[PDB]
Design a binder for this molecule. Structure first.
Ligand SMILES: Nc1nc2c(ncn2[C@@H]2O[C@H](COP(=O)(O)OP(=O)(O)OP(=O)(O)O)[C@@H](O)[C@H]2O)c(=O)[nH]1
Ligand SMILES: Nc1ncnc2c1ncn2[C@@H]1O[C@H](COP(=O)(O)OP(=O)(O)CP(=O)(O)O)[C@@H](O)[C@H]1O
Ligand SMILES: Nc1nc2c(ncn2[C@@H]2O[C@H](COP(=O)(O)OP(=O)(O)O)[C@@H](O)[C@H]2O)c(=O)[nH]1
Ligand SMILES: [Ca+2]
Ligand SMILES: [Mg+2]
Ligand SMILES: [Mg+2]
Ligand SMILES: [Mg+2]
Lengths: 423, 440, 54, 345
């Protein structure tokens, strides 16, 4: 059951590149596509993310998309650059200028058919295509505008397949342009309708974790992406290694999404790395549920957990893992909804990540995520009430109504999260 | 000699089928290559074991079993496992993608595309039967295949094999090893669609066998292998009368006749003893009275419930090992004076006892110690309705918010089927209450 | 108590102890059920493709 | 720390224990329908025992014994004493009783009503049920005309027309004892009982007047004219009652009465123990009981009724409720010396 990976834009390709860098190491595959591993657990579910070529070389089932060639070239020359299929690079020259409209309506519309051709040829060779995962930002133009265009086109062609995204939410604390709330609000409207699962990765949380916890005074995007690729590896551990819980994308969606529109997740990782003493099972459980280890910049105590998925990596006792998981929810049961019995499911994997002997990745569908969309909504309205910077978008053919609709739909999403926070 | 066809559906059904058929071969002396040197009638016979094994010209003894899963991983283990030579490829059926813990996806979407394949494969086994007596269906309540596809198969089996007995071995969902949050939904839906098509169903709560593995076997974190090897022992003691010479429960109809006076109330409670760890270096063998007494201890039941606060309708005692009737009678007389055994006033206070002199067989290298005598009690008590109440309550909590219902509607199922299924469980719950219950 | 219907053999033994006396859907309908869900499943997908075409 | 829920708020006894569970700083209260609890202060009717003991990693305790109603209902208690060989029907501490429905014991009741008539013996009976039924008469005809007129099932019992009368006053009483049974089925008798007395002098000729015959605290508050003369709230405690027995009868409360009380309590609870014990169950039970006794002229103690959801005297709420935390709750969920109870069994 194969997954097709797509990375779009500057952020999506840089984060996507680190992700393939991390999991290729976990599966014992060198930058030349050859396998030099020590355990058959590495190859047991390798087909989920890698195709096979003659000579027992493994090619990632990844498609690199961008409207300017800059980041594409950087990925091709960086580490693990030549592991990617050469013709799976689809890029233009104009760029999108941090403009959702340019990515979604004009510049990206000229390029989307080329991408769907690569998506089609990758899907046609799949034994039983499980679904798609997309990495992108919502604050730019290509990953935001063209990314959500791709999702809409892919859903039209593969309507019975799971659509998954890793979506980087913008923040004024790590900002490129002031129009990021516009692009983010336009993209959320698309994600609410056309994805089954979306991991909300807030650049504000990533910065704060790098600043306060990891003691990085001047964090870079590379520092933030080290955190993203680490959680991307953790949330996909159940998909890449033998397991019983949340082993495929649809089963995870059935366990994590009680209502179709509420499919935005808070990821969390422990321990946070930028490591000689191994962490204990109580220490992993306490950290992975702490706010400081959350990637969405939302205090979970401000809302309630609809469902929670947790994975533990390394050689440990499942007894102490069950004891600690049961301890954290029996002594914080007010933060878990009572109308979804047993909404916390745990999985374990014997393969630990690189450099760590024990690790824990957290996946939460909390109503506290509304804090994220409310921040975006306030930044959106602050400019939109004065129609500020709108000409960049109306110049690409957009109408003010489309902004009013995306704004209204996201405020509904916030109100719908507040509905289930009370019971 | 009337043949029996076993159908294993879903991951839980298939993996338990492995544990059982492995144990069947150890009990009848069948080697992994299908050969049985004990059988001197090569190529056929009307012996008792022939109800579960057919014979080829080469002397291979082949299970009368079909394995069905909407997903190839678990069954591919069988195709390459220790008993790969036991089954022939036609008996193993695998789909492309599974039901994703969705009853509707297993019943409607994927069920429609594979139900005719499965039935035709079942017809191939049925045609080799001079007088087929029915089916034993192993599945889970919680899985989308085990719940959704089974109820569809049980509907068609009643159509193609009219008034042929169908017995279930159903795995009740327990959160300690469960994989899905919607298992209450799947359980209620499959119990609704299957109720009229099942003559007798044995429920095993994974919670019950999980704790038995922790307490009696001293296993820290029991795995499915631990659980299934214990389940197979219970299944073997229930099907032993169909595979060995005897006079109690020698056909599938006798299970309904002996245990099910009311057709909807066809869920007997199973209790088993003794469960002794094989790593326990020193052990003192238990008596007939001690293992019979344990049959009335909740800690040894397949479903945790209190029979003292229900009413009995029937009781079967199935012994294996060194047990003579005098020991059983002296034990039952002692137990009646010390324990609360209340029968419904219209049924007779009695026990149907069966004894098989062969002691229970244990897989070499397993967790169970070989014991000189064991007993499995099948009792149709109204106390098992506690398991329906728990399930119905969890169903009620989620459904009041319509949590997750869009997954089922998205597969073509109508929201009204939830109500129709829950109303049926309410009626079933009221039926048990009619039968078992009479500032200061 | 009373022992009745005692049956013996070399394999085992069975009997009964008494202590106290007392005091369907057809194939056509199933195929219609599955096809009704198949049509509802196709109607929903058609509305999706209609929504995406707009 | 530990967690608990409350499902019967109009319970004065357990409203106080949940208040004490707060002050320890080691117990948090949850809402009614939160399943992740260690302790349930459950409701009085239809308590969902079947949903208890199925939460992984949660030792769960409940404040009621499933099946204890067979002792705490008039109809079932009569049946329990009549049929249990441990009580053997002919136990000397329970008045002659028959269950008459409005199966049926109407024939055998009239049979004993004739025997008492033949010997010209005291033939006065009482009619009670599960509010108040309040019928005492000397002829069974007036009893049944009232039973069938009422809806629910009533049970007839021989009236102890020769009761022990307190002086000064010439007044009868009933003794209430509180018994706590923990998860191990130890039987603890609270050292402090209470006497619920009558304020008017006892009268043998006026059975239609039900004030000097019925010792209920609600009836003495409603119909007694000189209520509260001798003791505060028609409640006399053990130290005063024991002093009276010494001054008036040259005996003690322990010797004359309490030995029989401890025997009656032990007998009733040891009988139903195999039916209600939670020794090897997936959940465990404790329960507080209120036994109602009666004493006659010859210092013989009679069991009248067992109450499964009793209240306490106002003076004794603090001591008794703290005892429930120590003995019944902290024994299963410890925190971070002389006892107020009397271990029987
Ligand atoms: N005792 C026991 N229970 C099992 C086993 N395998 C799965 N289960 C239980 O079955 C339930 C899940 O159903 P499954 O049988 O795994 O799912 P399925 O029938 O394959 O259906 P889908 O995977 O959704 O297509 C959970 O409650 C598991 O605890 C097993 O081998 N032994
Ligand atoms: N057989 C008898 N002989 C003498 N007095 C009796 C009696 N039966 C009952 N009584 C008197 O009747 C009073 C009330 O009886 P009972 O205890 O049944 O009422 P009740 O159950 O409504 C009050 P509670 O709330 O304590 O259960 C007793 O306190 C007792 O004085
Ligand atoms: N975490 C992270 N965020 C990024 C990175 N690059 C850009 N961003 C964020 O993404 C938004 C800009 O999106 P970008 O990918 O540059 O636009 P695009 O190339 O047109 O799709 C801003 O909110 C940036 O903070 C990166 O490498 N890591
Ligand atoms: Ca033969
Ligand atoms: Mg950029
Ligand atoms: Mg499966
Ligand atoms: Mg009362």
């Amino acid at each position: 059951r194969e997954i097709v990976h797509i990375q779009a834009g500057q952020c999506g390709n840089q984060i996507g590149a680190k992700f393939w860098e991390v999991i290729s190491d976990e599966h014992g595959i060198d930058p030349t596509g050859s396998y030099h591993g020590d355990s058959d657990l590495q190859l047991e579910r390798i087909n989920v993310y890698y195709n096979e070529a003659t000579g027992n070389k493994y090619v990632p089932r990844a498609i690199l998309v961008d409207l300017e060639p800059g980041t594409m070239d950087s990925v091709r020359s960086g580490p693990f650059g030549q592991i990617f299929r050469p013709d799976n690079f689809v890029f233009g020259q104009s760029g999108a200028g941090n403009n959702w409209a340019k990515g979604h309506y004009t510049e990206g519309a000229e390029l989307v058919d080329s991408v769907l051709d690569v998506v089609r040829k990758e899907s046609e060779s799949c034994d039983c295509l499980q679904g798609f995962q997309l990495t992108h930002s919502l604050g730019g133009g290509t990953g935001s505008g063209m990314g959500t265009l791709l999702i809409s086109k892919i859903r039209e062609e593969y309507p019975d397949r799971i659509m998954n995204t890793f979506s980087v939410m913008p923040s004024p604390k790590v900002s490129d342009t002031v129009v990021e709330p516009y692009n983010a609000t336009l993209s959320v409207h698309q994600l609410v309708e056309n994805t089954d699962e979306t991991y909300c990765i807030d650049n504000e949380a990533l910065y704060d974790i790098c600043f306060r916890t990891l003691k990085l005074t001047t964090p870079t995007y590379g520092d933030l992406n080290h955190l993203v690729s680490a959680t991307m590896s953790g949330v996909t551990t159940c998909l890449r290694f033998p397991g019983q819980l949340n082993a495929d994308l649809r089963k995870l969606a059935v366990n994590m999404v009680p209502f179709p529109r509420l499919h935005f997740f808070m990821p969390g990782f422990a321990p946070l790395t930028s490591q000689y003493r191994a962490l204990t099972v109580p220490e992993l459980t306490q950290q992975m549920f702490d706010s400081k280890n959350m990637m969405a910049a939302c205090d979970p105590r401000h809302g309630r957990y609809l469902t929670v998925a947790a994975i533990f990596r390394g050689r440990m006792s499942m007894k102490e893992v069950d004891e600690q998981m049961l301890n954290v929810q029996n002594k914080n049961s007010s933060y878990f909804v009572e109308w979804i019995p047993n909404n916390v499911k745990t999985a374990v994997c014997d393969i630990p990540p690189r450099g760590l002997k024990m690790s824990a990745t957290f996946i939460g569908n909390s109503t506290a995520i509304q804090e994220l969309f409310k921040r975006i909504s306030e930044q959106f309205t602050a400019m939109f009430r004065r129609k500020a910077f709108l000409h960049w978008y109306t110049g690409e053919g957009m109408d003010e109504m489309e902004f009013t609709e995306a704004e209204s739909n996201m405020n509904d999403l916030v109100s719908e999260y507040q509905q289930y926070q009370d019971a | 000699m009337r043949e029996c066809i076993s159908i294993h559906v879903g991951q839980a059904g298939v993996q338990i089928g492995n544990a059982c058929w492995e144990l069947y071969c150890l009990e009848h002396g069948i080697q992994p290559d299908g050969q049985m040197p004990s059988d001197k009638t090569i190529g056929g016979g009307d012996d008792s074991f022939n109800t579960f094994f057919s014979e080829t010209g080469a002397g291979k003894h082949v299970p009368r079993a079909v394995f069905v899963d909407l997903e190839p991983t678990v069954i591919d283990e069988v195709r390459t496992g220790t008993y790969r030579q036991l089954f022939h490829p036609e008996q193993l059926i695998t789909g492309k993608e599974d039901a994703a813990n969705n009853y509707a996806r297993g019943h409607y979407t994927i069920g429609k595309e594979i139900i005719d394949l499965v039935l035709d494969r079942i017809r191939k086994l049925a045609d080799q039967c001079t007088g087929l007596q029915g089916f034993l269906v192993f599945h889970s309540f919680g899985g989308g295949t085990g719940s959704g596809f089974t109820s569809l198969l049980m509907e068609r089996l009643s159509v193609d094999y009219g008034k042929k007995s169908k017995l279930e071995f159903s795995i009740y969902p327990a959160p300690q090893v469960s994989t899905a949050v919607v298992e209450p939904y799947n359980s209620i839906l499959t119990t609704h669609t299957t109720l009229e098509h099942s003559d007798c169903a044995f429920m095993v709560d994974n919670e019950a066998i999980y704790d038995i593995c922790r307490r009696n076997l001293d296993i820290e974190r029991p795995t499915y292998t631990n659980l299934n090897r214990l389940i197979s022992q219970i299944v073997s003691s229930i099907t032993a009368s169909l595979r060995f010479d005897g006079a109690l429960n020698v056909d599938l109809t006798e299970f309904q006749t002996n245990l099910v006076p009311y057709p909807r109330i066809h869920f007997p409670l199973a209790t088993y003893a003794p469960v002794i760890s094989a790593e326990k270096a020193y052990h003192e063998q238990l008596s007939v009275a001690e293992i019979t007494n344990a049959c009335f201890e909740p800690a040894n039941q397949m479903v945790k419930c209190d029979p003292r606060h229900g009413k009995y309708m029937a009781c079967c005692l199935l012994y294996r090992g060194d047990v003579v009737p005098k020991d059983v009678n002296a034990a039952i007389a002692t137990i009646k004076t010390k324990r609360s055994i209340q029968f419904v006033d219209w049924c007779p206070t009695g026990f149907k006892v069966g004894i098989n002199y062969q002691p229970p067989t244990v897989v070499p290298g397993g967790d169970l110690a070989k014991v000189q005598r064991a007993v499995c009690m099948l009792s149709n008590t109204t106390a098992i309705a506690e398991a329906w109440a728990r399930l119905d309550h969890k169903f009620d909590l989620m459904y009041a918010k319509r949590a997750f219902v869009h997954w089922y509607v998205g597969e073509g199922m109508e929201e009204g089927e939830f109500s129709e299924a829950r109303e049926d469980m309410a009626a079933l719950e009221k039926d048990y209450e009619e039968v078992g219950v009479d500032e200061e | 108590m009373e022992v009745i219907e005692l049956n013996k053999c070399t394999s085992g033994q069975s009997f009964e102890v008494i202590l106290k006396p007392p005091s369907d859907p057809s194939l056509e309908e199933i195929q219609k059920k599955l096809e009704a869900a198949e049509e509802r499943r196709k109607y929903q997908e058609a509305e999706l493709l209609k929504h995406l075409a707009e | 720390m530990y967690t608990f829920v409350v499902r019967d708020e109009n319970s004065s006894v357990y409203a106080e224990v949940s208040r004490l569970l707060l002050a320890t700083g080691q117990w948090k209260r949850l809402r009614k329908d939160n399943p992740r609890f260690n302790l349930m202060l459950g409701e009085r009717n239809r308590l969902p025992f079947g949903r208890l003991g199925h939460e992984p990693g949660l030792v769960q305790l409940v404040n009621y014994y499933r099946g204890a109603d067979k002792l705490c209902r008039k109809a079932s208690l009569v049946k329990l004493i009549k049929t249990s060989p441990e009580l053997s029907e002919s136990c000397t501490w329970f008045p002659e009783s028959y269950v008459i429905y409005p199966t049926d014991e109407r024939e055998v009741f009239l049979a004993a009503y004739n025997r008492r008539r033949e010997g010209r013996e005291g033939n006065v009976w009482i009619a009670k049920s599960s509010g108040e039924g309040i019928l005492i008469s000397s002829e069974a005809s007036e009893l049944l005309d009232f039973i069938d007129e009422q809806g629910q099932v009533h049970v007839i019992q021989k009236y102890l027309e020769k009761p022990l009368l307190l002086e000064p006053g010439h007044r009868k009483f009933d003794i209430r004892s509180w018994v706590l049974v923990d998860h191990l089925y130890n039987i603890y008798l609270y050292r402090e009982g209470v006497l619920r007395t009558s304020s008017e002098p006892y009268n043998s000729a006026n059975f239609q007047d039900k004030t000097c015959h019925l010792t209920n605290h609600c009836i003495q508050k409603e119909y007694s004219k000189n209520y509260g003369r001798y003791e505060e709230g028609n409640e006399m405690f053990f130290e005063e009652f024991n002093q009276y027995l010494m001054d008036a009868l040259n005996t003690t409360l322990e010797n004359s009465i309490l030995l029989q009380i401890k025997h009656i309590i032990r007998s009733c609870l040891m009988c139903i123990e195999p039916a209600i014990s939670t020794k090897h169950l997936h959940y465990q039970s404790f329960q507080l009981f209120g036994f109602d006794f009666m004493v006659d002229e010859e210092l013989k103690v009679w069991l009248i009724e067992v109450n499964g959801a009793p209240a306490c005297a106002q003076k004794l709420y603090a001591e008794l409720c703290q005892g429930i935390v120590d003995v019944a709750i902290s024994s299963v969920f410890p925190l971070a010396p002389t006892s107020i109870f009397i271990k029987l069994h």
